[PDB]
Scaffold this motif. Structure first.
Motif, short mmCIF file in Angstrom:
data_model
loop_
_atom_site.label_atom_id
_atom_site.label_comp_id
_atom_site.label_asym_id
_atom_site.label_seq_id
_atom_site.Cartn_x
_atom_site.Cartn_y
_atom_site.Cartn_z
N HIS A 51 0.72 -2.55 7.70
CA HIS A 51 -0.45 -1.73 7.42
C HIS A 51 -1.58 -2.04 8.38
O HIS A 51 -1.63 -3.10 9.00
N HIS A 91 -8.60 -0.02 3.89
CA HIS A 91 -7.25 0.40 4.24
C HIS A 91 -7.17 1.84 4.75
O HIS A 91 -7.76 2.76 4.15
N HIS A 92 -6.43 2.05 5.86
CA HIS A 92 -6.29 3.39 6.41
C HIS A 92 -4.88 3.92 6.64
O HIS A 92 -4.69 5.14 6.61
N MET A 93 -3.90 3.07 6.95
CA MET A 93 -2.61 3.62 7.38
C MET A 93 -1.48 2.61 7.30
O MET A 93 -1.68 1.39 7.18
N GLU A 94 -0.27 3.16 7.41
CA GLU A 94 0.97 2.41 7.48
C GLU A 94 1.63 2.67 8.83
O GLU A 94 1.51 3.75 9.40
N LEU A 95 2.32 1.67 9.31
CA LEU A 95 3.07 1.79 10.55
C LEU A 95 4.55 1.93 10.24
O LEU A 95 5.00 1.58 9.14
N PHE A 107 0.86 -1.17 0.00
CA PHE A 107 0.00 0.00 0.00
C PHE A 107 0.90 1.22 0.00
O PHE A 107 1.78 1.33 0.86
N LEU A 108 0.69 2.11 -0.95
CA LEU A 108 1.45 3.34 -1.05
C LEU A 108 0.52 4.54 -0.79
O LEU A 108 -0.66 4.39 -0.48
N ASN A 109 1.07 5.74 -0.94
CA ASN A 109 0.24 6.93 -0.81
C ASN A 109 -0.95 6.85 -1.76
O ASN A 109 -0.80 6.48 -2.93
N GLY A 110 -2.12 7.19 -1.25
CA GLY A 110 -3.32 7.22 -2.06
C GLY A 110 -4.08 5.92 -2.09
O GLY A 110 -5.17 5.86 -2.69
N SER A 111 -3.56 4.88 -1.44
CA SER A 111 -4.24 3.58 -1.43
C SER A 111 -5.41 3.52 -0.46
O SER A 111 -6.16 2.53 -0.49
N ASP A 171 -6.89 6.26 13.67
CA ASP A 171 -6.75 7.07 12.46
C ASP A 171 -6.35 8.51 12.83
O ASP A 171 -7.10 9.48 12.64
N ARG A 172 -5.14 8.62 13.36
CA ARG A 172 -4.45 9.90 13.48
C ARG A 172 -3.02 9.77 12.95
O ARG A 172 -2.46 8.67 12.93
N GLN A 173 -2.44 10.90 12.54
CA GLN A 173 -1.10 10.92 11.93
C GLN A 173 -0.05 10.87 13.03
O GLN A 173 0.58 11.88 13.39
N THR A 174 0.14 9.67 13.58
CA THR A 174 1.19 9.37 14.55
C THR A 174 1.86 8.07 14.18
O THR A 174 1.29 7.22 13.48
N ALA A 175 3.09 7.90 14.65
CA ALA A 175 3.81 6.64 14.51
C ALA A 175 3.30 5.68 15.57
O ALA A 175 3.43 5.93 16.77
C1 LIG Z 1 -4.07 6.76 2.87
O1 LIG Z 1 -3.86 6.68 1.46
C2 LIG Z 1 -2.70 6.62 3.57
C3 LIG Z 1 -2.05 5.24 3.20
C4 LIG Z 1 -0.62 5.11 3.72
C5 LIG Z 1 0.35 6.14 3.14
C6 LIG Z 1 1.67 5.44 2.89
N1 LIG Z 1 1.34 4.01 2.92
C7 LIG Z 1 0.06 3.78 3.39
O2 LIG Z 1 -0.49 2.70 3.53
N2 LIG Z 1 -2.82 6.75 5.03
C8 LIG Z 1 -2.38 7.86 5.74
O3 LIG Z 1 -1.88 8.79 5.11
C9 LIG Z 1 -2.49 7.99 7.25
C10 LIG Z 1 -3.42 9.11 7.64
C11 LIG Z 1 -3.83 9.12 9.10
C12 LIG Z 1 -4.61 10.42 9.42
C13 LIG Z 1 -4.66 7.90 9.45
N3 LIG Z 1 -1.15 8.18 7.85
C14 LIG Z 1 -0.15 7.29 7.62
O4 LIG Z 1 -0.22 6.22 7.02
O5 LIG Z 1 1.07 7.63 8.13
C15 LIG Z 1 2.12 6.84 7.88
C16 LIG Z 1 3.20 7.64 8.71
C17 LIG Z 1 3.27 7.04 10.12
C18 LIG Z 1 4.73 6.60 10.20
C19 LIG Z 1 4.93 5.47 9.19
C20 LIG Z 1 5.01 6.14 7.89
C21 LIG Z 1 4.62 7.59 8.18
C22 LIG Z 1 5.38 7.82 9.51
#
Ligand SMILES: *[C@H](O)[C@H](C[C@@H]1CCNC1=O)NC(=O)[C@H](CC(C)C)NC(=O)OC[C@H]1C[C@H]2CC[C@@H]1C2
Ligand SMILES: *[C@H](O)[C@H](C[C@@H]1CCNC1=O)NC(=O)[C@H](CC(C)C)NC(=O)OC[C@H]1C[C@H]2CC[C@@H]1C2
Lengths: 297, 299
Positions: free
Chosen positions: A170, A161-165, A138-142, A185-189
Motif C-alpha cells: 500500500h 491512505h490512498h492506494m494499493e500496488l 486495506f480494502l476498497n473504501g479504506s 494518485d492515478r489509477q495505474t499499476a
Molecule cells: C481508496 O479506498 C482505494 C484503496 C485501495 C483499493 C483496494 N485496496 C486499497 O488499498 N484506492 C484506490 O482506489 C486507488 C485510486 C487511485 C485514483 C489513486 N487505486 C488503486 O488502489 O488501484 C489499485 C489497482 C492498481 C493495481 C493493484 C490493484 C488494482 C490494480
C-alpha cells in the motif's frame, strides 16, 4: 511478544465520511477542517490521468457530502494541498485531540486505524518500508484511513491512505499530501523500488527474543560494524548506522549483549538460515518492531 | 494477513483505576458499576492463599479509591461475584457503550486494551489457547485490563486479566468472574495443560489460502469427523467440535469446499508434511486467525 498498536480512541473521534458523486471514502475532522484524499473528486474516466486542478475548480462546496455519523456537516470552503483535499466545515469537532502532522522516516512504525464509510473497523501496527510502501490490510473504501503515533496526550498523524500496488502492498501520503515514495494518485499499476530489510529493527526483535528467554541463535563470535554492514548489504539489509547502534543501547545493557555481538548472530542467521528453527514463533526474521516498540513492551 | 485489533475507543471510555491501600489495578466502569479483580483487596501477606470472604467483610465502601483519571468516583456499595469485585458508584458512566458479557471458547480471538493505572497503553489481538491461557503483553499493574470483541456497535467483553503463570503466559476470568481454565487467584505456582494447535483456526487459514488462489493442498477425498479427530490428536491438534464445524460454514460456502474435505486436506498435510512447499508464503500453518478474522481481512 506481539505487535501492539496505540489506543485508537482519540483518532476514532475524528473519522467522518466524505462523498463526491458516486465516490465515498474517509476523512479526518480536526477543528473545522476535514482532510481526505483528493481522488474522491475523480470519476472512472478521470482516474487514469486526472488533472486535479481542473477537476477541482469545476467543483463547488455543495458537491461534497460530509457525514459525521447520521449528521451532515456543511462544507463552507475547499482547497487542495498536494494530494489532500481540505474541506472547511461550519462546525468544530469537540473531540479533536491535541495533535501534530509529522513525516516519518523509513523504518519507523505507526498505528493504522482502518476505516470504511467513516466507521472504524480495525487497528494495527505498520512500518514504513525502506521502499516507502506499507504492508497493510486495506480494502476498497479504506482511503482516508490514517496512521499515527501517540506521545503523552498528543496524536502525531503521519499517514493517510490512498492506494494499493499490484504486489498487494500500500501507498499513501503524509497529512500535507506528499506521497511517501515515487507513487502517484492515478489509477495505474505502480511498482516500488527494491525493498530492503530494516536491520536495526531485526536487531531489536532478536533482543526481544532474548529477553523472552530465547537464545539458540546467539554465539560467542563478534564482528566490526563495517564487516557486518558488508554482509547486511549483500543480503539487501539496510546498513546499520552508529545512531542505530546507540539507539540499541538500552536493550544491549538490559541483556548484557553488545550490539555488535548481536550483529554477529544476525550475520550467522543470514548466511546459514534458521534451519527449521523459529524465533518468537516466527520462521522469518521480523523487521517491523523498532527499538522503542520493543522497549516499551 | 495481519493480527488486527478492534478499535479501542469504546473500551478506553470505560477504564478506571481501583486502589486499596497501595495496591492499584484497573477496573471497568459500565453504567453505575465498576468491575475489577477481587485481589485488589489483598496485601502481600494475603496473596499466597487469601481468605477473600474474610478480607471483604473487613472492607467498607470508604476503603475503595476509584478514579477516572485524577477524578474520584464515590463508591456506594460493594460485592464479590466469583473472582471479580463489583463496586457500585454514584455516577453512571456517560461513555457506557452498548455492551454484553460473553464467555468465549478456546481458539476464539479478542482484542486486549493493555492498561496501567487506568491509562491505556496499547491494543492487540490475542487468541485463547486450548489450555485456557493467552500470550499477552501484561506487565505489573495490568490486572483488570479487559479483552473484547465489537459487533456492530456492541462491545462484548470476554476477558479480565488476573495473573501470570510460571511459563510466562497469562490467565484470567470472564466479566462474571469465572476463570478460564483450572486456575485460581492465589500467588502460587500453577501449571497449564500442555497446549495444542487450534485446528478450527488452521482450517480457516487454509480456506483463506484457497480464497487467494493458493490451493495445491486440496485433494479428491474426504474423511469422517471422528476419523479426523483421532488423527488430529496424534499431532497435538485440538479435536473439532460441532460449533467449529458450524463456524466454518461461511468459508465453506464461499469456497465450495466442504468442511470435511478440508479436514481431509489437513490430515494429509499432518501426515506427509509440506514437502518443501509453502501456503500463503509460510512453511508453517497459522492457528491464531479465526474464521471471523479471515472473512474480515479477505472480504
Ligand atoms: C481508496 O479506498 C482505494 C484503496 C485501495 C483499493 C483496494 N485496496 C486499497 O488499498 N484506492 C484506490 O482506489 C486507488 C485510486 C487511485 C485514483 C489513486 N487505486 C488503486 O488502489 O488501484 C489499485 C489497482 C492498481 C493495481 C493493484 C490493484 C488494482 C490494480
Ligand atoms: C496484576 O496486575 C498482576 C499481573 C501479573 C504480574 C506480572 N504479569 C502478570 O500477568 N497479577 C498478580 O500480581 C497476581 C496476583 C495473585 C493474587 C493472582 N500474581 C501473579 O500473577 O503471580 C504469578 C505467580 C506464579 C509465578 C510467577 C510469578 C508468581 C510466581
Amino acid at each position: 511478544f506481539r505487535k501492539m498498536a496505540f489506543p485508537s480512541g482519540k483518532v476514532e473521534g475524528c473519522m467522518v465520511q466524505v462523498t463526491c458523486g458516486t465516490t465515498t471514502l474517509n476523512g479526518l475532522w480536526l477543528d473545522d477542517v476535514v482532510y481526505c484524499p483528493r481522488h474522491v473528486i475523480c470519476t472512472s474516466e478521470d482516474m487514469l490521468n486526472p488533472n486535479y486542478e481542473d477537476l477541482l475548480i469545476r467543483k463547488s462546496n455543495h458537491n461534497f457530502l460530509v457525514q459525521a455519523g447520521n449528521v451532515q456537516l456543511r462544507v463552507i470552503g475547499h482547497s487542495m494541498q498536494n494530494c489532500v483535499l481540505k474541506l472547511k466545515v461550519d462546525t468544530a469537532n469537540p473531540k479533536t485531540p491535541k495533535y501534530k502532522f509529522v513525516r516519518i522516516q523509513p523504518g519507523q512504525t505507526f498505528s493504522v486505524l482502518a476505516c470504511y464509510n467513516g466507521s472504524p473497523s480495525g487497528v494495527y501496527q505498520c512500518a514504513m518500508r525502506p521502499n516507502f510502501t506499507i504492508k497493510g490490510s486495506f480494502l476498497n473504501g479504506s482511503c482516508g484511513s490514517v496512521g499515527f503515533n501517540i506521545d503523552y496526550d498528543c496524536v502525531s498523524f503521519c499517514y493517510m491512505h490512498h492506494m494499493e500496488l499490484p504486489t498487494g502492498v500500500h501507498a499513501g501520503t503524509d497529512l500535507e499530501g506528499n506521497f511517501y515514495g515515487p507513487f502517484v494518485d492515478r489509477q495505474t499499476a505502480q511498482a516500488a523500488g527494491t525493498d530492503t530489510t530494516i536491520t536495526v529493527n531485526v536487531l531489536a526483535w532478536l533482543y526481544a527474543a532474548v529477553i523472552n528467554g530465547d537464545r539458540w541463535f546467539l554465539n560467542r563470535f563478534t564482528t566490526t560494524l563495517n564487516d557486518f554492514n558488508l554482509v547486511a548489504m549483500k543480503y539487501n539489509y539496510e546498513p546499520l548506522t552508529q545512531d542505530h547502534v546507540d539507539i540499541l543501547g538500552p536493550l544491549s545493557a538490559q541483556t548484557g549483549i553488545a550490539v555488535l555481538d548481536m550483529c554477529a548472530s544476525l550475520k550467522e542467521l543470514l548466511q546459514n538460515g534458521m534451519n527449521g528453527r523459529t524465533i518468537l514463533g516466527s520462521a522469518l526474521l521480523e523487521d517491523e518492531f523498532t527499538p522503542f516498540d520493543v522497549v516499551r513492551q
